[PDB]
Symmetry: C2
Subunit: 271 residues, 2 copies
């Protein structure tokens, strides 16, 4: 949607893009459907199946959100595995390198834990959407019966103008219309309420998790200053790294700001 | 319809019935359908067949009238045969008896000739009814097409409210309605005209033929006075019959009144 007014689907570069040019496209693009294969697309296909034809789209969205959740669960546990592997690799290295890589590993572990909490809040969002899907599916048969009744009464009117069955189904249809009006009014109310609440909670969760992980990334950037990037000539060895206390103080302050973080202290501000 | 207010289909006796009691029912009632058999009922059955379903009753009436005409033709020629046979029988009898029976035979021949003329006028009536039947049969397909078109447009309205075919058939049906209104107006006019003219002519024909045959019967009753009903004793013979001139004068006067008869000289008068 950010594409410029040209013939190319090229997004307009932001100030960050001008500051640092965008990198080349990733080489990880594999020759695959990109939906987890037929095994993971079985759920997607089953979403588009014999349903109430009304919550079909909503049920499909819910099951797609379940796929989202499964993928995020896959990238959280295996990311914390990556952090563990990074610490294991940094075990046998320079003392400053080992300390700094262990601190980066623990920061990534914090990242994975926040991802898991975001996953739980995502499941709350998905459960609210499941509730709205189920109430919509329960309210659909009312309108289905309404459509069937109006079609049958139209056919009966075609057959003759004085069948008692005609008047009886008209009398039942005036009841069905009122019940369907009430059902659709409450359906609109519940859909609006669930939609607003679920998406407000979802956006609050994502902004909280994202600003928290950004607060973590800033602390990690500050921590990365401890190691010295000055190259050392072959032969003599550089002085030993004694910044253990500084790194521990940095991680302590990061923990303190992490625990102190609250919705009131949301330094992110729109304009 | 002349039956009294009782539980029996016994007609109220008129003054003639009081004057002379009614005779016993005829013994000529045969064990038969009374419609000329299946050969003569084939036409009646074919009248009730694949027709325009409107002139079906009128065509059936016309063919029944044809059966009427055939039966009347059968009883006219064979009645004149009966008159010839009566003259042949009276050939060998008393002179007065022979003369009087020959005069009765010629009166019956006049009766048969008047019957034949009545048959021709009956055929005029039947031809007028054939004309009205044929115009009604020609006007029926208009209303048949109207009914078919309205049924089809009702079904098309059931299917959807915006088919172009719907509006096109509505535009053709508003034309068909006007043409059917004109057709039914002219149909009513022609039916009334043909009905009134044909039945007025039929009733004039029947009253003319009937009053003429009654005028004949009165002359025959006057003529029957010539013969003597006084019994003669065995032995001597009664004086010879010389009333030939009187009988010839009676028949001459009957011929004169027959030729002089006109619609103006219709001595029959209703009240």
């Amino acid at each position: 949607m950010h594409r410029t007014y040209s013939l190319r689907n090229s997004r307009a570069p932001t100030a960050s893009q001008l500051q640092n040019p965008p990198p080349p496209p990733s080489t990880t693009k594999g020759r695959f459907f990109g939906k987890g294969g037929l095994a993971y697309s079985f759920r997607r296909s089953a979403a588009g199946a014999f349903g109430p034809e009304l919550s079909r789209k909503l049920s499909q969205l819910v099951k797609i959100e379940k796929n989202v959740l499964r993928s995020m669960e896959l990238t959280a546990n295996e990311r914390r595995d990556a952090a563990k592997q990074l610490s294991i690799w940094g075990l046998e290295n320079d003392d400053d390198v080992s300390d700094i890589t262990d601190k980066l590993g623990v920061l990534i572990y914090e990242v994975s834990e926040l991802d898991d909490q975001f996953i739980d809040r995502y499941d709350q969002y998905r459960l609210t959407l499941k509730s709205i899907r189920d109430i919509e599916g329960s309210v659909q048969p009312s309108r289905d019966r309404k459509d069937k009744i109006t079609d049958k009464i139209a056919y009966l009117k075609y057959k003759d103008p004085q069948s008692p069955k005609i008047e009886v189904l008209e009398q039942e249809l005036v009841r069905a219309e009122a019940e369907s009006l009430v059902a659709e009014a409450q359906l609109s109310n519940i859909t609006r309420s669930k939609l607003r609440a679920a998406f407000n909670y979802q956006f609050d969760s994502i902004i909280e998790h994202s600003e928290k992980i950004a607060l973590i990334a800033g602390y990690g950037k500050a921590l990365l200053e401890l190691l010295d990037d000055s190259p050392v000539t072959p032969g003599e060895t550089r002085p030993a790294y004694d910044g253990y206390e500084a790194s521990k103080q940095i991680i302590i302050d990061a923990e303190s700001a992490l625990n102190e973080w609250t919705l009131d202290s949301a330094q992110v501000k729109p304009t």
